[model samples]
Target: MISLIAALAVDRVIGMENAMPWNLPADLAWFKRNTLNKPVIMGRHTWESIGRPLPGRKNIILSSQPGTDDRVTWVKSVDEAIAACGDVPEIMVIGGGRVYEQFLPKAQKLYLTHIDAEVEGDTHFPDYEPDDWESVFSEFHDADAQNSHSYCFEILERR
Candidate 1:
């Protein structure tokens, strides 16, 4: 299954410049826990923001420019990115902005962290209606020293 994992503000703000607007260590830990060991696909900008391949997962990047690196596999398109996943049972679309909208309809599941505040950002998560999804799991974390804003980790499966 193609699944998505991301933390977006309540107003759907996802990025500022080319980076996340908020700083949440708890969310980072949560991200590592959930995405570890999965083959993760991302857009070029996303890869640039991360700088290096995530430690224990196959990093497949969707980029137009050519490059060679043992750490990552660069594909010209989303189709190729999916192909790079090969026989993996599941793949995670770890985003930028462009990548998520493309896979939203194709994805069977979404792993989302909804932050409590609205933020100013250049990029925003694509609008998705609640009726199209069914929540299967949810966990809430209140604002604390590690996490500035309260948030909820919710896993939604498409109906």
Candidate 2:
């Protein structure tokens, strides 16, 4: 299955000034746990921002430019990233906006963490209609009590 993972804002704003407005350890841990031992595909900028290979996932960075982690295979196209996954049980498409748009049509599942706040952001997730997906699960967490910002985690799949 192909999955897309992201933490978006109230307005579907993903990043402000090309970086996250806030960092939540819980979300980070969630990402790591879910992506562990899997092939994680992402855009070049996301790779650069991460600075190095992720601890347990097979990192595949897509870019028109060259040179990235040796542990991370670099691809110039989304097709290449999909091909590289072979028949892995799941492929996680982590992103920086550009990559998400490229693969959204084929994604079988979506793991979204929706933050209940808005911020000025240069990059935003593409607008998607509610009717397009079926929600399999959802949960809300309190920011103050959780020691993080308010957010809801949702899992969906195309109907």
Candidate 3:
């Protein structure tokens, strides 16, 4: 299955200064738990922003620029990234907008965390029609000491 995972704010904001604008521990934990052990495809910017290999998952970096890493696979095209997954249970597209734009249309499932607060960001996620997707899963997490904002984790399958 091809899955797309991301967290966006009310304004569709995703990143600022090559990093997350909010510190939502719950969302971060949710992300790790869901994508763990999956073959995850990430844009070069998202891969570079994290600055370290995301443990337990196979990191598939989509970039034209060369990088050497025994722990990860680099691909120049989206087709190559999808091909790298082969028959995996799930191939997740973890984004940086540009990559998501290409893969979102092809994604069968989506894991999105929607935050209540809107903040400043340079990058943004694309808009989607809720009518076209079925919400297979939904969970709301309120802001806590560790979480910067209230958010809801919604797993959608294309209709």
Candidate 4:
């Protein structure tokens, strides 16, 4: 399975200044819990924005630039990175805008957090047809003292 994950605002905003615009602790925790121990592919920009390899998951960085590190497996394309997962039950695509766009068509599942507020952002989630996907699961979380905004975690499967 190929899974694409993102936390998007109402306006489709995903990031600003190369980082998430809203601070939602539960959403972050949700992401960590699901992605842990999975093979995760990310664009060069997203990898850079994250600063380092995410421990517990196999980090597959999508970049043409040549470099090697014990912490990650670098691949030039999305297909190559996804293939790296081999027989794993699922591979994750965690992204910057371009990477998400590239993997959207290939993704079998989408894990999205729908944030209630809209804010300024330089990167946005690519548009997709809701008619083609069915929502299989949804959990709403209200904004609290620690979380910056209200959000709902939803799992969508291509129909």
Q: Give per-residue CA lDDT, model 3, range 8-116, as digits (tens).
A: 9878999998998678888889999999988999998998899989999889999898867767999999999999888988888999899888987888899999999
Which pairs clash inside model 2?
none
lDDT of 4 by residue, 30-139 (tens): 99998999999998889889998899999999889875676799898777887888899988889989999999998889999999987899999999998989999999
Candidate 1 TM-score, true structure as reference: 0.95
TM-score of each: 0.95, 0.94, 0.95, 0.96
Per-residue lDDT over 1-159 for candidate 2, one digit per residue giving the tens place of the 0 to 100 score: 899999898788888665787877778877788889999998988887778898778788898888645778988788888898878999999998998898888888999998877688888887777899999999888877554688788999999
Clashing residue pairs in candidate 3 (N, C-alpha, C atoms within 3 angstroms): none
CA lDDT, every prediction?
0.89, 0.85, 0.89, 0.90
Stretches off by above 4 angstroms in model 1 are none
Model 1 C-alpha lDDT per residue in residues 35-127, reported as the tens digit of each score: 899899999898889888899999998888896676788889888888888987889999978999998989999999999987888888889
Stretches of candidate 2 off by over 4 Å are none
Which candidate tops TM-score? 4
User: Worst ten-residue run, lDDT, model 4?
Assistant: 62-71
Ordered from best to worst TM-score, the candidate numbers read 4, 1, 3, 2
TM-score of 3: 0.95
> Clashes per prediction?
0, 0, 0, 0
